[PDB]
Design a protein around this nucleic acid. Sequence first.
RNA 1: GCACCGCGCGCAGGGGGGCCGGCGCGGCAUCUGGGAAGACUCCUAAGGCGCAAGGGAAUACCCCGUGCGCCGGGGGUUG
Lengths: 289, 133, 237, 226, 109, 54, 121
Amino acid sequence: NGGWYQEVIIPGGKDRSVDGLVWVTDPDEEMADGKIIHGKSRLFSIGYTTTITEWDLEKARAKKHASGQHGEIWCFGVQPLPAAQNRKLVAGTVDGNLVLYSIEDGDLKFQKTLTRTPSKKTKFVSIAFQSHNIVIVGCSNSTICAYDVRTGTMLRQMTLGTDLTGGSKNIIVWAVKCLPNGDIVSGDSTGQVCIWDGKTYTQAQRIQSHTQDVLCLSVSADGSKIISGGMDRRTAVYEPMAGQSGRWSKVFHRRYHQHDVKAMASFEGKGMSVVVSGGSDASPIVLPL
Amino acid sequence: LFILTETSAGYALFKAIKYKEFAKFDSAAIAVEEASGILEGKVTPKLASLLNELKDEKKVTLAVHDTKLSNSITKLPGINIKPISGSMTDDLFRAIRQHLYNLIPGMEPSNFDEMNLGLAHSLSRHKLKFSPE
Amino acid sequence: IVEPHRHKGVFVARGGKEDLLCTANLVPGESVYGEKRISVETPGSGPDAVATKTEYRIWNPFRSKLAAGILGGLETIYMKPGSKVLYLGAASGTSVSHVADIVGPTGAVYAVEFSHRSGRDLINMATRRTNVIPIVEDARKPMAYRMLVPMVDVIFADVAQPDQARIVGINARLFLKQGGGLLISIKASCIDSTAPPEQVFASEVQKLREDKFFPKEQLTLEPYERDHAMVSCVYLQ
Amino acid sequence: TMERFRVSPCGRYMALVASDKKGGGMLNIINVGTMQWIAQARIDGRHGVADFAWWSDGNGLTIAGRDGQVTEWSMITRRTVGIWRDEGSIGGTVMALGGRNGPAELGGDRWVAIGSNSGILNVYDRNDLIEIRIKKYPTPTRVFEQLTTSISVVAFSPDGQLLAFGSQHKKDALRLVHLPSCTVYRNWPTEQTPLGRVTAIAFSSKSDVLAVGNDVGRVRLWEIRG
Amino acid sequence: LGYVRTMRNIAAKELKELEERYVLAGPKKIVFFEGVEERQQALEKQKARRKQLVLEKLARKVKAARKKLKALADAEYELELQQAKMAKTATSGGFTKSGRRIKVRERKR
Amino acid sequence: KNPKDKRVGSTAYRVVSNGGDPRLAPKAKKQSLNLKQALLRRDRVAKPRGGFFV
Amino acid sequence: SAAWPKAEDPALVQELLDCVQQASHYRQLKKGANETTKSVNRGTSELVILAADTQPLSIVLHIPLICEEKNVPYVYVPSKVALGRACGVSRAVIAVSLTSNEASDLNSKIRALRDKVERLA
RNA sequence: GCACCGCGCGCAGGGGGGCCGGCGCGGCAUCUGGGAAGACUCCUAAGGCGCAAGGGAAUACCCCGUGCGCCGGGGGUUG
């Protein structure tokens, strides 16, 4: 409740990094008498390898490893709740193939591969789920693909243009996330933030916000605020424009960090709405949301 | 510790290390009905004649490695003892079939694999008519 | 002239310009899929000079995965006449007939093939040779033929699925003996068609090794096929 | 560039295709009276935007890109109404949009005509796109395969009774089509009708005069009389 | 064209049979070990003209059969280009004798 | 690390190696870590690093 | 259904139909189910593209058997009309088969395209 | 083994290192060259291409104006 006490540090070895972190929290189970068993929360990570690691916070070391024959995993996420005991991780990678791992009953194993891109030069850099069965992935070849997890099919390939600010024509969608009403918010290599329609999968807005590329996004739990953190050490806050629906605009920006803002995540509960942004200056900055 | 073993012919039970009892069968076209009855987990006469004791449940245990068969024979009220699923029970149901040469002088002093072959042919041709030609 | 090879149950036929592989036909006077066969007698019949007793079916390594391993330098094949081999991926009864002729009448080969047309030709082959039993079931579901298959000695595995090591893993946890044998044929263009095949094969060997096999050897099938490996390994010993 | 544009029929807006292909084309929409940017409509394709057409009431516009994706994009909600696909188009070249008494929420134009690079021009009744949901695979009212080279021009009559579509790359490759019957007129053009290599066509405001201008630089005029 | 197609089918069957016979006549193998000790023990255990003529003969037969199949395949391709050059309408395919490649972009109506 | 393989000329004898990662973490691929940086610094150059120093 | 190596990605479908159009201009293409079957049986065929919009789908299902016997890659595009006017036919073509030769930029495109089809499989 | 009043040299090879310099394989945001390339673009010109004969030669290469065809330019009023 505003104390921010650092409890445990579990260090990895030499030549070992951590790129993505995902908690998997089960829903509230109920006993025979009306007592509440809360969700057991398991921590998964990737380390710029082909291996998803599950961490044991009780023993303060790594619990499990899973790996399939594919490239290095660059982004992953846990499928949201609509099933109940059958939840699955979806992981994008370098060479393209969206691998899909299974987690149930204390297990982490490489289940299958949904699809892969035709072009071998498509690298998957960010992933976010719109619903239980629709996965929105950003790619390096200027696309935001929207796959469907059950059959593994492809709903639509959203695209973005060249960057006309410098060279290097391929834009890179560094962070996608999904609003609660269905829209998709995506920060990319131009420092833009695009608002994509949820039903049609076309863009509805381009908001030029940053100068260098937007590296991480965060979306409020009720869908009212968007926080964008870029490589120009800049954090920008957007609220919807009054009147027309689906139109966002940048309320204000400020440079909170001293290097780029590589990751941030939000929390809103028990009288505490924060968003914690960690960058490359090792200082996690907590903003009130 | 009642274990439930299903071969192509019959069943065995090793509750007290060493084998305790059995149930034998041979050479009928109701063997494929037994086969479908454990493809689902339905009522089975060999199953019921095995699990029918007269006293009570004396300790609620029946070790069957497939969870589907376990929670389909949980629902039968004929004996109301509740079974257990495969709690990584590899050692039991692997060692009994590797050391099943010890069992063969007990219930069927013979080689019963010809009806295993016949049931395999019957099931495979049943599925080849399920994909009809 | 016919000699037996180093592998028991496998024969070679030698001539002035050729060297062919062959097996001892369990049903003499009968061929299966259009294969050449040689009649040889045991010596002691000079006045008659009729090739009466032994009929040998020529094993074709261009249609067999296992026969491409034996001519490649497979040190053991883990099976002798009288063993028990589970054949995973029996495509229309091509190699499983030669495996049945290797294991003989006191051996038995359990063929598993999910695909229905190859199941049709497999059962129409398997009617004659009685030492095979065919199972038309998905190899990714071993509890559907757990009643039908007893404990085996060798698992042969030629199935074109990306979770080939997982299929081998569940079938070996349910059917292979302690200290058993596994001969698996790995297809790189089936598992990952973009990585180097050495890397694909090394990842499959590592998956078996964490799946509690012991990789003894690996050899490529590359005068005969393209980007195919054969891993010969033992189970728990 | 500012080469390709379309002014709205109400005269208030004007859309310009932005020269940025990269697997999907956008077009910037400009208020006519003040000459300022007011919107932008982006579609996904392979080479961008083949053509587009404003709706008849003047709000939205239908953007037919290359590789067959056609997109109805409204001006009121300022996002995409829907996306459908031309039937079997390996790549679109031109589109036109005309008639009256169409669907009320899709601009009120009845017919859309999309001509591909093979030579085939499909004509769809726009009351068949509504399944606001658009069918992802509508069927054409009529597929015209009379011209063999890529369809370069297409133009509806302003009262929505004629449709003239022509290819530039053949001498005298122009056809004239009745609507709603979708039948090619067989009596004109004949073997000796001096069309030339047709580069632009234009129907009159009362639709009494067809003007055809070729690659030599000669306009010729034809009274339409029914 | 029909005659060249039948001769190409016969010659392709001959090439397949001859290449099978040549392979049957004449970092490949990897053996794994648990440790350097077992690897060195196996290395201790490793420390403990007719075919040339007939394989050169089969190799010359294989090269002549490949030349024959390549010649018949080039003949069949040249005859398909002759069909394209003599079609009743303008069809793409083939080079002119000036060198410029024929390509018509009309559709077959 | 791992002992390098020894080739007789036809076959290759190699020690298996998985003794690097017991329970700790898998070692990050330096080729993939430098690729994500090269997507972050595309054509852009660094500013001069420190103060007055050779 | 029975069209399991389906090409669903529109970028890959556009690449397949562009290579079909280039082979059609090179006269390196066999159009139709019977001509496709003849090219696959004779073994001159490098890649084979079937269409999944066939109204009885079972009239092109024999070609996967011959391609499994001859080890050539087959792939399914969505629309047979698109395949037809990609070849330049003005009819609906349900199966097409594009062949190989000695040395071509088209042959390099064929090798890359069957690599992409093997990525689908 | 050579010098038993010496360093060192000729040679077998056991392991690890400087991972210094090359080679091979793989990815590589861009940049450079080539091919293909959009059909508004180029398509060599008001003409050209093909097939089959005929005639001549630097005799491997080619050139020229008869019979069938395929386009193109120009001209061109609901045939």
